[PDB]
From a paper:
Human D-2-HGDH is a member of the 2-hydroxy acid dehydrogenase subfamily of the VAO/PCMH flavoprotein family. Regardless of their promiscuous metabolic origins, D-2-HG and L-2-HG can be converted back to 2-OG by two mitochondrial enzymes in humans, namely D-2-HG and L-2-HG dehydrogenases (D-2-HGDH and L-2-HGDH). Like other members of the VAO/PCMH flavoprotein family, D-2-HGDH is comprised of two major domains named the FAD-binding domain and the substrate-binding domain supplemented with a small C-terminal domain. The active site resides at the interface of the FAD-binding domain and the substrate-binding domain, and consists of the FAD-binding site and the substrate-binding site.
Crystallization of D-2-HGDH in the absence of any ligands yielded crystals of D-2-HGDH in apo form. Structure of the apo D-2-HGDH was solved at 2.20 Å resolution, and structures of D-2-HGDH in complexes with D-2-HG, D-MAL, D-LAC, L-2-HG, and 2-OG were solved at 2.65 Å, 2.80 Å, 2.62 Å, 3.00 Å, and 2.80 Å resolution, respectively. The asymmetric unit contains two D-2-HGDH molecules with essentially identical conformation. In all the structures, there is a FAD non-covalently bound to the active site, which is apparently co-purified with the enzyme, indicating that D-2-HGDH binds FAD tightly. In the apo D-2-HGDH structure, there is no metal ion or ligand bound at the active site. In the apo structure, the substrate-binding site is occupied by several water molecules; in the D-2-HG-bound structure, there are a Zn2+ and a D-2-HG bound at the substrate-binding site. The structural comparison shows that the binding of Zn2+ and D-2-HG does not induce notable conformational changes at the substrate-binding site as well except for Glu475 which adopts a different side-chain conformation to interact with the Zn2+. In all the D-2-HGDH structures, the FAD assumes an elongated conformation with the isoalloxazine ring in a distal position from the AMP moiety.
Residue numbers in the entry:
A (entry chain B): 53 to 519
B (entry chain A): 54 to 519
């Protein structure tokens, strides 16, 4: 059981200070604070008594200045779609929301450089840049709710990572407010700049424990002229792996996504979201996207790829689409898996990097190990990046099932020299299992970084680093 | 400017170093001459000790000793850096990675390379290309630069347009801190969000925060087809429109877009005796493509050239897919920096500017100095907004320096640009970062330096302001 650290509490005088700093941006009604206190999975509830919703970087600076002087803990929050308990308070930390920091500052129609506030919603930024023939360098199933500042803070991966890479590469600059309210200006909207240390990198993946991101400068790829999606049934995981290998060999540079899911995933999306499968029933499914400049060439590459995959028995049934409507329908089958799982019951969630050759082994194992105690066990995700999403559903949480899952799943991953948190990050849930993926000396340097940047520890206590 | 109060190497220090790295203690004064002079040959240190460790543990024991004794250390790779970062200012110990040159592993499927910091870039390219992979970066200094130095300087280079930053392609680092502590961030995972991305601090840290000893890096697959078009353009408006059309018509196969002006071509012909393959033009553009289907690439290139030649964007062009002729065309661009240093004294600027006004400073400087310069040239990575600006003179003039500085830095700042796009900061640029970075940023940089190396023994006098 975690113990509340000796922070102060919010007084009426603090509430009047916040009303001065952000007029109309202070929410205190207990019924209104219910939702922002509960995480996306609905298995964690905080006891925060104040939600602050600033509009500007200066307002965030003044809020944190006040909290630093008063020794008040702060819980940054974006879209609240995070999966690891980082997004809601543990006790009574002030919820500092970016919901109203949702303005675009500038967009350069030649460089493709976007500069916008941290609370812009990913899907809305995609619509904005696509109107100008660019795309966001990342996409994820949470796009409708997650904030760009949240994506940077968690170092979100997602569905086009294989093509455009990490936020560590695509973020050009950040504005960050530090714990004492210092505005750190690293908002360098330049493709290249080697003038000292890359300070912004510290805040990518730091999950709001080192500062609050208020403005983001991000490189947007050009919008592809041609997008294709193929959705394929494979008769086993070995054929999934050869379909991936063959796919890289025959599609090459136009590959923009490679996702897999198992039969149980398909059944749950069908059962809870009523989405019919467009291919024959198979034990594994694969979604492939391509993105390129020449429709004709991409079609020829894809045509030959399918022919060879179908010819050599890697794929048993497959369908292809270019019409935007049909493309979105195929993508829904993968994107909405996470929703279908949470409608199925209580979800035990694991987000692992493993050797691609052994990515599905743990799923087969756990189906045997838990038996009928698990309502379902699934494996899916970013196979091209070595990333498995392992989930177990049950009618209700149980201590018996948790004891079967942990530490067994984490030991498997360490045995494979894998990551116990591939993309979702650490937050509250995984803060004490980092030893399975990171050595002690690295963990200590992280602690020193935290002490340097937030010596009072008012920013997101109880998370990201070990206790 | 003035030597900080570090200890001096005694006879007992030499004997300690001989125990730690037997055979790797060079004290011969004639042998120390070359490692004390930077690549441009305008800076020269007075170090009397060169250490050549073989392993990471040897590096750790050296720094433990240097930390206890308060001796300054100057890490050195291939010594091709351009900003005086790689050579001592006074009598700093030169720690060379020259002997840290082994490949440790290479996964033939994932393309993940683990190697020691002193592996030469050219040699790593050879190694992974024999296995159908390529390095994610390439530079004109490939023959000499070390992968450790590339990571320490956050090198950009000639295929950055396609594969992007080392901040993205580097998967893991082993770093030895100033006190000897071995920091293990040598993960080989594509995705790992288990805490802070500590390795990122050392990419671009220029040896002031730790010595990189091992690098893990993601190698892209080797392309089936590489094409190079070397094109002559009748003006910079056409250079910019050739770039725009190139992105629309070549797209995802594009792997390089470089430009150079007429004077650059003249200088490589004069000093290096390399002939131009196209008609004389005011500007030249080198376009590279890399793709998986050679026929699709050739069709894309065909339609692009036809349109560019047809619309007057390009006047004359030559294409190559043969490896020998591709290197010939590339040599015309890669060897400009060499041709300039043979033209006389070189004033060198490496700027990030809006692409639409990348060449304006070249035109401005030509009017501003007129006959007081020998040549003013502009070339470089136009696709990434990165201009290499050089002025040559028959000899150095404090006058010409006063005309160039601060003027060039102020122009760049007026464009919200970077006064060092690629080459970094080192000794030369430590006091001009204010044109690209605000004081609060520079202050936090100093706080990180104080945390990781409180004694300041690693690379004094560089990277951060005085
Ligand atoms: C359906 C679904 C699909 C998903 N798919 C993916 C996927 O493919 N890949 C992936 O990586 N993740 C995925 N996620 C989780 C992912 O982390 C979030 O979707 C997103 O990255 C977080 O954005 P947010 O604004 O919701 O952040 P929040 O949940 O609000 O917060 C995330 C963390 O960052 C901190 N934080 C938030 N905003 C800021 C800020 N401005 N400055 C500093 N710290 C801040 C918070 O305190 C918290 O610790 C998915 C989630 C869902 C529900
Ligand atoms: C012809 C030519 C072309 C070039 N082209 C480019 C180009 O296109 N793009 C570009 O970005 N640069 C370019 N450069 C310069 C570039 O910075 C270096 O060539 C390259 O980055 C590798 O440097 P190096 O191994 O020679 O390191 P050095 O010059 O030896 O060292 C550079 C700096 O890094 C530090 N350092 C070196 N090794 C380590 C280590 N293991 N750990 C910690 N710190 C270390 C040194 O202390 C120093 O501050 C070019 C140089 C030349 C001569």
């Amino acid at each position: 059981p975690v113990r509340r650290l000796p922070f102060s509490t919010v007084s009426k005088q603090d509430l009047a200070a916040f009303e001065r700093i952000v007029p109309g941006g202070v929410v205190t009604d207990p019924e209104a604070l219910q939702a922002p206190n509960v995480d996306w999975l609905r298995t964690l509830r905080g006891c925060s008594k104040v939600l602050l919703r600033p509009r500007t970087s200066e307002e965030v600076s003044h809020i944190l200045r006040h909290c630093h002087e008063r020794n008040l803990a702060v819980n940054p929050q974006g879209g609240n779609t995070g999966m690891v308990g980082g997004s809601v308070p543990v006790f009574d930390e002030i919820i500092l929301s970016t919901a109203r920091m949702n303005r675009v500052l500038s967009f350069h129609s030649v460089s493709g450089i976007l500069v916008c506030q941290a609370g812009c919603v990913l899907e809305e930024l995609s619509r904005y840049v696509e109107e100008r023939d660019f795309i966001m360098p990342l996409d994820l199933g949470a796009k409708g709710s997650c904030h760009i500042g949240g994506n940077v803070a968690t170092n979100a991966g997602g569905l086009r990572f294989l093509r455009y890479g990490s936020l560590h590469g695509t973020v050009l600059g950040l504005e960050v407010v530090l714990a004492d309210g210092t505005v750190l200006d690293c908002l360098t909207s330049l493709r290249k700049d080697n003038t000292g240390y890359d300070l912004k990198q510290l805040f990518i993946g730091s999950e709001g424990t080192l500062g609050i991101i208020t403005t983001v400068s991000i490189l947007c790829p050009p919008k592809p002229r041609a997008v294709n999606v193929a959705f394929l049934g494979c008769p086993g995981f070995a054929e999934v792996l050869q379909t991936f290998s063959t796919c890289k060999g025959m599609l090459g540079e136009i590959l923009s996504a490679f996702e897999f899911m198992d039969a149980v995933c398909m059944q749950l999306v069908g059962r809870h979201l009523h989405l019919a499968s467009p291919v024959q029933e198979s034990p594994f499914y694969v979604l492939i996207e391509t993105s390129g400049s020449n429709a004709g060439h991409d079609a020829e590459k894809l045509g030959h790829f399918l022919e060879h995959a179908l010819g050599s028995g890697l794929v048993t049934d497959g369908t292809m689409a270019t019409d935007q409507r049909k493309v979105k329908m195929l993508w829904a089958l993968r994107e909405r898996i996470t929703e279908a799982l949470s409608r199925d019951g209580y979800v035990y969630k694991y987000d692992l990097s493993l050797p691609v050759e052994r990515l599905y082994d743990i799923v087969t194992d756990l189906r045997a190990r838990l038996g009928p105690h698990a309502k379902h066990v699934v494996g899916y995700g970013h196979l091209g990046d070595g990333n498995l999403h392992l989930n177990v559903t049950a009618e209700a949480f149980s201590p018996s099932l948790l004891a079967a899952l942990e530490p067994h799943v984490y030991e498997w991953t360490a045995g494979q020299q894998g990551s116990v948190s591939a993309e979702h990050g650490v937050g509250f849930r995984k803060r004490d299992v980092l030893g399975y993926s990171k050595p002690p000396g690295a963990l200590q340097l992280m602690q020193q970084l935290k002490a340097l940047l937030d010596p009072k520890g008012i920013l997101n206590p109880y998370k990201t680093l070990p206790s």
